Coordinates of C-alpha atoms and ligand atoms in Angstrom, one line a residue:
Chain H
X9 CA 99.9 113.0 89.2
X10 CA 97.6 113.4 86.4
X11 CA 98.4 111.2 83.8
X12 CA 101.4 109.4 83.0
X13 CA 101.5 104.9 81.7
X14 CA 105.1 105.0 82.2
X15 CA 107.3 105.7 85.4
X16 CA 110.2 104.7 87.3
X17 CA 110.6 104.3 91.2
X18 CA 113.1 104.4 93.8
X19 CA 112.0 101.7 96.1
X20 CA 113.0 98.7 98.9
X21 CA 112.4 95.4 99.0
X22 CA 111.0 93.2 102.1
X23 CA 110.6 90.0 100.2
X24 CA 108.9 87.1 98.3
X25 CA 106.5 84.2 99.1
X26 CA 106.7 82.2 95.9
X27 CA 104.9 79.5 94.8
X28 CA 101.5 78.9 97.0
X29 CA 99.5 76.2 96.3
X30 CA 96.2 78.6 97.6
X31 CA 97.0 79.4 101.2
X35 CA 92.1 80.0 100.3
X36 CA 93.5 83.5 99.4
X37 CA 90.6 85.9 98.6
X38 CA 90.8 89.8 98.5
X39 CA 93.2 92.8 99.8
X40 CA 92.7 92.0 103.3
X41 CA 93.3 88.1 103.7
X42 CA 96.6 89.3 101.3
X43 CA 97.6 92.0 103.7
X44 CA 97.0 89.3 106.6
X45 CA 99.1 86.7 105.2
X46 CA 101.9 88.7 104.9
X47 CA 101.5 90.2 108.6
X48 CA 101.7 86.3 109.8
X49 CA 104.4 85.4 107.4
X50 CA 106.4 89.0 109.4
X51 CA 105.6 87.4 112.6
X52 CA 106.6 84.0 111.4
X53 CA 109.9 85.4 110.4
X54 CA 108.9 84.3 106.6
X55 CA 109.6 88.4 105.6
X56 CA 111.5 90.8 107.7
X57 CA 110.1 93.5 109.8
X58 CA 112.5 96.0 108.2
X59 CA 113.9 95.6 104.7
X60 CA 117.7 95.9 103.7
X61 CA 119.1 99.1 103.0
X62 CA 119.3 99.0 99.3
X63 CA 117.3 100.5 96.5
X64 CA 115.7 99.0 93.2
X65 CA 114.2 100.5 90.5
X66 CA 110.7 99.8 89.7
X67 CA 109.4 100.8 86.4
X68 CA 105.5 100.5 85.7
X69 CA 104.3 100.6 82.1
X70 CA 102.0 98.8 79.6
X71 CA 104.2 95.5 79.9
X72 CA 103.8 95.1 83.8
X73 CA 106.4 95.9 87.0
X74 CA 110.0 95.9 86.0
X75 CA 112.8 95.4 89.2
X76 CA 115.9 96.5 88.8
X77 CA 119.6 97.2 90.7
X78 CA 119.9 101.0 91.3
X79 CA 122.7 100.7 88.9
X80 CA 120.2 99.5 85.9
X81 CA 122.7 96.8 85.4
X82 CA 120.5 94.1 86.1
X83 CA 116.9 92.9 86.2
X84 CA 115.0 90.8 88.9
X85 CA 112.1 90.3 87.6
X86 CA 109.5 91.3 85.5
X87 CA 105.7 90.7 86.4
X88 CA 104.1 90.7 83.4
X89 CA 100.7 92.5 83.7
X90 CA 98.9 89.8 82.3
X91 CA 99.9 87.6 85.3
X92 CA 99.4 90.4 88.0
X93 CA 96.3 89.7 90.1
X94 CA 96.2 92.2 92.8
X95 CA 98.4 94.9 93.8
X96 CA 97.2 96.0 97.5
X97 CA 99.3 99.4 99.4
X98 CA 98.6 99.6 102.9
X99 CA 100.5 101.2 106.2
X100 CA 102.7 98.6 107.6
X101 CA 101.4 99.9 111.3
X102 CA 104.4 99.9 113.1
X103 CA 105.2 103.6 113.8
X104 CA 107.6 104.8 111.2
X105 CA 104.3 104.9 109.5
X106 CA 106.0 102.7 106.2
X107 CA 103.7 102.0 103.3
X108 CA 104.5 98.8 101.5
X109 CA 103.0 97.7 97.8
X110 CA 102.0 93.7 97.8
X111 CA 101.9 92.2 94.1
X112 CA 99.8 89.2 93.7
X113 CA 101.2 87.5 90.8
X114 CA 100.1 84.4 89.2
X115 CA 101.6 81.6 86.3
X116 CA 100.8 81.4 82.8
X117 CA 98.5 78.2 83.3
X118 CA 96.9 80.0 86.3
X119 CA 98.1 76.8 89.0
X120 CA 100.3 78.8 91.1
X121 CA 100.7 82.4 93.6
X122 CA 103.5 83.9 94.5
X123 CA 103.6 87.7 96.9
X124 CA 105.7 90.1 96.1
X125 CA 106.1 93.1 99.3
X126 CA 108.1 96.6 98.6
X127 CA 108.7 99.6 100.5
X128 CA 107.4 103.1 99.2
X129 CA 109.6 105.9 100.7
X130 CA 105.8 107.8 101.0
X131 CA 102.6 106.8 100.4
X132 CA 102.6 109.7 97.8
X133 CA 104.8 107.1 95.9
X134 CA 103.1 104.3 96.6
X135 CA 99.8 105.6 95.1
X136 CA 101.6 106.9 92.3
X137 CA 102.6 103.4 91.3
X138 CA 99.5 102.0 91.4
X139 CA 97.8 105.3 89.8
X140 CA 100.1 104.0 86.6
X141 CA 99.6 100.7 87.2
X142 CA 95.7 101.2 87.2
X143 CA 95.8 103.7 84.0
X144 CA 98.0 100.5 82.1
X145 CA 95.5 98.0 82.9
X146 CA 92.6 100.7 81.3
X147 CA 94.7 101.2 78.6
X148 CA 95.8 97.9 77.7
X149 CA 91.8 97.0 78.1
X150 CA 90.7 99.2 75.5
Chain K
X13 CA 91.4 70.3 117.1
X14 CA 91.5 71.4 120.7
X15 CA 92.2 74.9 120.8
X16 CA 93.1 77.5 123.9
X17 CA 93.2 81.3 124.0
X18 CA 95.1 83.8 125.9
X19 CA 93.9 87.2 125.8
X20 CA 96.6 90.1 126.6
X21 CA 96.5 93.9 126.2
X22 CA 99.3 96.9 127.9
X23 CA 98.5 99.6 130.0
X27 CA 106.0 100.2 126.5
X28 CA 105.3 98.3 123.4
X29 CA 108.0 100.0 121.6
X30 CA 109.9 99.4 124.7
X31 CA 113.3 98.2 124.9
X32 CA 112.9 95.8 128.0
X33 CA 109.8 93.4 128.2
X34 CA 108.1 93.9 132.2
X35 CA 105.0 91.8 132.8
X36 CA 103.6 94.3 134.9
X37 CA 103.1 96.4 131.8
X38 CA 100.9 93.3 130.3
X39 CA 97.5 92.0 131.5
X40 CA 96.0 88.4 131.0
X41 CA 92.0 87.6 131.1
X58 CA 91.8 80.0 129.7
X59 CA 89.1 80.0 126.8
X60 CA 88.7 76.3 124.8
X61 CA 87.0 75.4 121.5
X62 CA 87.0 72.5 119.3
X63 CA 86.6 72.1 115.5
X67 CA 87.7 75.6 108.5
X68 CA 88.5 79.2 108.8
X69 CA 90.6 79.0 111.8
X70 CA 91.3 83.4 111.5
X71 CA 87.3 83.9 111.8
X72 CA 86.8 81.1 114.2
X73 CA 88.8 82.3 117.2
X74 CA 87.7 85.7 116.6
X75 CA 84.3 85.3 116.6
X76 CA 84.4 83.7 119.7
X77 CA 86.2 86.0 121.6
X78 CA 84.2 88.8 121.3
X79 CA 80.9 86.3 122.1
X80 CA 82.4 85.9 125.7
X94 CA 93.4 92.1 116.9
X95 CA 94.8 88.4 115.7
X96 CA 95.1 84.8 116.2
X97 CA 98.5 84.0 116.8
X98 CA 99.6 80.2 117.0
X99 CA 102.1 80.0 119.3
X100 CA 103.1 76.4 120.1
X101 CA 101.5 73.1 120.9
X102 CA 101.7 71.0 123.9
X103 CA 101.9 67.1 123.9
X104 CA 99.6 65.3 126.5
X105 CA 100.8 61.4 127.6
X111 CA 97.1 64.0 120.9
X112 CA 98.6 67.5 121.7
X113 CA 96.6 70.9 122.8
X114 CA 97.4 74.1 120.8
X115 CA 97.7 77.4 122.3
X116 CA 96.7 80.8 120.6
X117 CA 97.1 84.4 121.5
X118 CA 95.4 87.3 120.9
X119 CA 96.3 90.9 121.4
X120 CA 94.1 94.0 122.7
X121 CA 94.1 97.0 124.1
X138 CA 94.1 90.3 135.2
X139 CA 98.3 91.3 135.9
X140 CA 101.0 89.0 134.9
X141 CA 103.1 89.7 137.2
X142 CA 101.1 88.8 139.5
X143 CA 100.6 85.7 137.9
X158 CA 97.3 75.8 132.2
X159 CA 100.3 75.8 134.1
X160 CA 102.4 74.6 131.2
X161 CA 100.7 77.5 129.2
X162 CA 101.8 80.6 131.7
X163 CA 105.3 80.2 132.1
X164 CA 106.0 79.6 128.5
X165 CA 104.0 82.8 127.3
X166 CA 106.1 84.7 129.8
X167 CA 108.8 83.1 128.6
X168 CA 108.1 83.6 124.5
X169 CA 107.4 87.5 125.4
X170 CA 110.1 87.9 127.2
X171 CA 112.1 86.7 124.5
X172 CA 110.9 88.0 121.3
X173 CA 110.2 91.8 123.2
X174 CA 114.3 91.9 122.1
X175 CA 113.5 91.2 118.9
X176 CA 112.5 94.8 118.1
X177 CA 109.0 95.6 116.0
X178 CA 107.7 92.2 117.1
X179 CA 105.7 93.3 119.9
X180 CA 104.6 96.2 117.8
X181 CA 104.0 94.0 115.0
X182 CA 101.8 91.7 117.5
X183 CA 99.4 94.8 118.5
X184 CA 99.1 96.4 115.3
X185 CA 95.9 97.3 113.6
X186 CA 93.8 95.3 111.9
X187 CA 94.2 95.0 107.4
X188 CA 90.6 97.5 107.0
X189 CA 92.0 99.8 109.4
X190 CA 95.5 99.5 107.2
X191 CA 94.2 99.0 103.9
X192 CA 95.1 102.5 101.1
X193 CA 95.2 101.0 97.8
X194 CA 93.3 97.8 96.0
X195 CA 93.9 97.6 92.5
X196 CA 92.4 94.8 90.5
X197 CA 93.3 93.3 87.0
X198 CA 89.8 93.1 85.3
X199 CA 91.5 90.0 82.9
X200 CA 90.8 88.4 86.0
X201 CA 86.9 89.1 86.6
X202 CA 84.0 87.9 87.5
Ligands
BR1 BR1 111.0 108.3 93.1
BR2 BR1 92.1 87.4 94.7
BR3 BR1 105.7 82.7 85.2

């Protein structure tokens, strides 16, 4: 809700699909169709594990943590996010996942990032901050 | 190059079991880029693409299906018995048939956001 550029996430994890050459990738929906193949391929599971990161959103980018804070995964610096998609999963359960298209520092290389939102309340929550960080950051 | 289609759609699909009676069957054939537009496009001339495997000929013929919404079990030979054999299969897999008839990305699609470095 109205207006916060800093904010931490409880969230799941379906998986990764690092390193594309290009596939040819242009827009939400060829993003969101990719990883719906790569689901049916077995590339990324249908249903992610059981345990829960923490995703912090701010003015440097996505932060992944352990629940315990102990240790971070990654960080996706916002300068080398290209896209960040949320759609319904369609399965059912009615699941809304977050897809991060990420990039390299020399611009040669993709990778796809997929989470699990416990709503979709959250999930446009994270890209409401991530939005107001890339407007902010803009100046 | 060669390409076939097989065009399926149910009456289930969160079902435990897989029965082919549930399941209906319309094969299509095109030769050849975009392989997602192609088959789609031609379909509805005459949900997905979904390669499913390639059969040698002795050069090999690929075989593509594609979910909707004739009876299979009351049913190119090579083709017929090994769809009713990969659904019968994956259908005990559990959210793969769901998966396989699920809405299309625009009817998915909540969020886009867009990093403007990245323009034009
Ligand atoms: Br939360
Ligand atoms: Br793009
Ligand atoms: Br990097």
């Amino acid at each position: 809700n109205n207006s916060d550029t800093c904010a931490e996430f409880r969230i799941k994890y379906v998986g990764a699909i690092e390193k594309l050459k290009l596939s040819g990738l242009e827009g939400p929906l060829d993003l969101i169709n990719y990883i719906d193949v790569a689901q049916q391929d077995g590339k990324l599971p249908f249903v992610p594990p059981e345990e829960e990161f923490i995703m912090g959103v701010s003015k440097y980018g996505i932060k992944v943590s352990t629940s315990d804070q102990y240790d971070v995964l990654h960080r996706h610096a916002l300068y080398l996010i290209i896209r960040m998609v949320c759609y319904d999963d369609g399965l059912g359960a009615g699941k809304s996942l977050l897809a991060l298209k990420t990039t390299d520092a020399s611009n040669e290389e993709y990778s796809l990032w997929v989470y699990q939102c416990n709503s979709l309340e959250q999930a446009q929550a994270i890209c409401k901050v991530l939005s107001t960080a890339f407007d902010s950051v803009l100046t | 190059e060669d390409a076939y289609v097989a065009v399926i759609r149910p009456k289930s699909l969160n079902s435990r079991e897989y029965r082919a009676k549930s399941y209906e069957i319309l094969l299509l054939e095109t030769k050849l880029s975009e392989i997602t537009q192609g088959i789609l496009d031609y379909v509805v001339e005459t949900k997905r693409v979904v390669l499913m495997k390639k059969f040698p000929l002795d050069r090999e013929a690929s075989l593509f299906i594609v979910p909707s919404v004739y009876c299979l079990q009351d049913i190119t030979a090579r083709m017929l018995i090994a769809l009713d054999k990969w659904l019968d299969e994956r259908h005990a897999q559990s959210h793969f048939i769901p998966a396989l008839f699920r809405p299309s990305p625009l009817e998915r699609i909540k969020t886009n956001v867009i990093n403007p470095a990245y323009a034009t």
